[model samples]
Target: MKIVLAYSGGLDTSIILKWLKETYRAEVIAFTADIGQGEEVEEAREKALRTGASKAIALDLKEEFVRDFVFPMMRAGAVYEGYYLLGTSIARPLIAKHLVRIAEEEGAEAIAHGATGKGNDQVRFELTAYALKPDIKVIAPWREWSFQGRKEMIAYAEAHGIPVPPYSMDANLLHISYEGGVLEDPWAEPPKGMFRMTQDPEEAPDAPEYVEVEFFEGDPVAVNGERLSPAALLQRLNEIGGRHGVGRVDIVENRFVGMKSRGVYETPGGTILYHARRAVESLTLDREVLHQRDMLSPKYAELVYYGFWYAPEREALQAYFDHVARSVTGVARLKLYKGNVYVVGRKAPKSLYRGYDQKDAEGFIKIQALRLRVRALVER
Candidate 1:
């Protein structure tokens, strides 16, 4: 038998890679999805091959990720639980889809993953796998294996001669993630060492980094006057922002699967993009349409976070998002300094900010205040 494992090269995945090959007597083919973690992709591919994958496929999905995945959701202004960018939460299903595709291409009978039983990724991965390929055998090592935590996984890695991560691993390097060991304690502070991208604001540099971002219909297309593909744009931004400690977040979030989990996120470029888009939105989006978009954004965020990326509801909501963004073409100036994303300027040809002019706002407010007028008249 053969299996395609969604390998992340983390401590858990490293151990699981060896375990799957041993327990099932299967040729485990590893597939790693690159979603802007800032790791060397070639290194992950080589690591998988060295760790006993019959074959390892590294999908360079950076462009597809930012364009096809992140941008559409960004147009929707999707943010789960009010604060999170849904960084780690949203990446799961896409990875699952690619894993299944690889399984088919490789003529493999089964797909496996390293998501733990307690967290949301298991649901995200399994749901996408089963939903996409109903008959494909699914293996979740974390659910079936005797290994309980990272420490146990380490011992297994040593026994099997699987090269473990040099550093004591925590969560994967992501801008916003809420999973695994240190995160179990909701009140605990995230260690400074846990972060791979961005710096703490307290220790960030005094100098500000100025950037000009171009957007076409709500998708970022370039950074700092350089035209780039979606993945390249975000990747470049991640590097620039990572140097300044531009994106890092730790929060206790309510998961759709139940329970509040502590998640730490490292979204270097995404933070910058989100702020830039919002800055343009401030000057461009119509009040009523923007209001409606804001109202629906949380729901859209939930759908994506809960692994419904291809569902009808998400599709329908995306239409709404697209309609709201029909006029969202523009450029935005942003200042990245000390972990702060400051929107310094914005311009759009179809600006909706004109309505805020005093005479226009005054007339509109007066016309819309009939209920207040009635209340005053009744009281008087």
Candidate 2:
């Protein structure tokens, strides 16, 4: 048998790579999607080969990730449960799509992932796989395997000579997230050493720095007047936002598995973009349009979080989001100071509100209150 495994070169997948080879006697093709996990991707590809993958493939998906997955979600203003950025959730479908594609290209019989049955990723990976290529066999080793938890995986990795990452991380261009282990405790503060992307707020610069972000049709295009490619722009903002410790959230979020999981996310650049774009929209978008979009934003977010990117409903909503986004061209000036992104100024060429007139407001209020006046008189 031949299987394509979503290999991260971490302990779980490393052990699974060997396990699949041993159990199914399959030729394993290891596939790693480079969504901005930095130099670690090289190591993963190398480890996959060294540990016995028949063929290892690593694809650079940074630009596509930002342009297709991240930007469209941002257009919908889809924030999961208000503060969680859906960074990890958004990358799953893209990764799974390629995994299935690779499996078909290689004539592999099954695609596999290291996601546990208890976690959301198992659903994310399997859902996208079945949606894209129905009848594609899925091998979720965590659900079927005898090994339980990270400690067992660590032992298996040691027995097999595979390297173990100190912590469990799911990183892409959008954000780097750490979960499990010490982070399992809801009240425990994450150690300063754990963060790979952001500085601590207390240790950040004392003085504030001002930056300008320009949005073209709802997506951020330029930073401080310099145009950058989509990935370059997000990386640039990550550097800038990280310095000031701008994006960090610690919360016990509701998992799709009916459990509350504690996690800490660092999304400095995404946070800045989210806030800055909203500021620009305040100037450009019509009040009712914005309100209607706001009403639907959470549903859009749910579709993404629940791993239905291929569904027609999400595509339909994306069309509406695209329409609302056409007028969201503008610039927003912000002050970054020790983890705070303060929107100071925003302007757009197609702004809806010029100014408010007291006389017009009086007439508008009187007209709006006519029904209220009739109801009050009739009740009295």
Candidate 3:
């Protein structure tokens, strides 16, 4: 039997690569996805091969990731639970779709993943696979296997000569989630060593940096003056924003499967993008339309986070978001300092800058009141 495993060269997946081969006597092929996680995909593939896989494939899906998946959702100004930018949450369905394609290309009987039962990834990965290819066999080793934690997985890897990430098992840039270890203590702070993207908030840069984003129809096309593709723009911002310690969030969020999870995330580029987009939207969106769309933004974010990317409800709402954002074409200038990204200025040809839309100011209110009284007297 041939099994295609989603291998990340991390402890859990590396161990599973070997376990699938040994326990079921199956030929294992590994697949790695480069989803702007800033890791060397080739190195991951090499380690997967070294860990006893028959073949390994690394696919770069950054363009499809940001453009098709992320950009579309950003139109709705969707932020999960009013905090999360939906970084890691948004990348799942794209990966799962590609995983199904790769499985068919390899003629593998089953595809396996290392997502634990406690997390949302297992559902995200499996549900997408089943949706795309219902008959496909999916092996979730974390659910089926009896290994307690990374320690046991490490022991198994050592026994079978499987390689793991040199540093530790905690990886994933969209959010550095910790649950089973030092993170279990609700009141405890994460260790300094656990931070990968941003410096501690206290140690962030003293001075602020002004950043400008240029957009077309709500989609960010360039940073400053440098025009880049959707993925490249985000990557550039990630590098710049990450240097000064921006976009760090710690939240105890509600998981889709009725569980509370505390996750710490560093989303430097995404934070910038969110603010910049909102700045433009402020200038261009109609008042009533913006208000209506903003109300539904949380629901849109929830659907994406809960692995319902392909659901009809999300698509239906997308139409509303797109309608509201039709004229959202503008430039947003922002200042990034220490972990804060806020809009400094914004401009658009379609801006509704009527300072006194309501007749409540000095002479205007009196004039309207006089007209109302005259109308009442006339009616009487």
Candidate 4:
């Protein structure tokens, strides 16, 4: 049987490349897609070949990733449980879609992944694959194999004279997530320099940097008045925010696979955009529309984090978010210092705000407090 495996040049996936071939006597091809993880994708093919892959393919999907997936999700201002930027959460479907295409092109009968049963990735990868290609078989060695743990895996590699390779890290253009190792024990602090997207917050510049982010229809379009493409815009922002140590997070998130996992993440650019986009929305969105959008945003975030990107509910929610954001063309001047994005100023052509009149508020309060006043009178 021929199988196309979603391969990363990481320890887990590299080992799985060999396991797929040995266990099932299957011919396995490896596929890697660049989603701006800052890794060397060019060497992935050779890395797979070294690990016993029959063939390997690499593709660049950065532009499509940020433009189609990341920005669309940002429209709803999705922060999973108020902290996560959903960076790694957003890159899965795009990777799996390309994997399906590569599977067909390579004439592979089934596709495989290294996502274990304990994590959310297994659902993300398999869900995306099944949605795109019905009747395509999938192989998940993590569920079927019992390779003890890291110690046994290392022994397996040693007995076979195969190379061994860090803490579990998942990165894309939007964010970098680190789990396992020192991170596994919540009480133990992460070692220095582990989160690499930004400098240490304590070491950041005292002189605050002010960045003006321009938005067009809720999506970031420019930086400092210079227009840029979607990917270019994020790259520039990552550089800006990373210098100030802006987007860093530590949270024990509720994993979609029915467990809690401690994940450390750095989202230098994504944090900047999240705050900046909201600043613009503050200026442009109507009061009730914004409230309604806020009410549904958590569910939107929940859906995205649950790997339901192709699901219908998220599409309808996107429509509401997009409509509310239609007037969110503006600029947000933010002060970036020591990991904080303070909105220094916000302006938009479609702004609907007007400072309140003190006289008008007198009757407004009476109208609003009518029920409260009557309830007090009826009390014993």
| Local lDDT at 286 for model 1 | 79
Better of 1 and 2 by lDDT: 2
TM-score of candidate 1 on Cα atoms, chains taken together: 0.87
Off by over 4 Å in 3: 148-152, 163-179, 355-380
Runs of candidate 1 exceeding 4 Å displacement: 148-155, 164-184, 355-380
Tens digits of lDDT, candidate 1, 313-369: 998999989987877888999888887788889988777665168789888888899
* lDDT (C-alpha, whole model) for all candidates: 0.80, 0.90, 0.80, 0.88
Give TM per candidate: 0.87, 0.94, 0.88, 0.93
Where does model 2 exceed 4 Å of error?
148-152, 163-167, 355-363
What tens digits encode model 4's per-residue C-alpha lDDT throughout 101-159? 88898888799998887889888888889988888899998998999897998888777
Q: Please say which candidate is ahead in TM-score: 3 or 4.
A: 4
Which candidate, 1 or 2, would have the higher TM-score against the true structure? 2
- Per-residue accuracy of model 2 over 151-187 as CA lDDT, tens digit each: 8778888888887654578778789898888998888
TM-score of 4: 0.93
lDDT of 3: 0.80
For candidate 3, lDDT tens digit of each residue in 89-194?
Answer: 7788887887788889988878888887778888888878888888999998878888777687788777887654412233333434345466655677767767
Clash counts per candidate, in order, are 11, 0, 0, 0
Number of the candidate with higher lDDT, 2 or 3: 2
Order the numbered candidates by TM-score, best leading.
2, 4, 3, 1
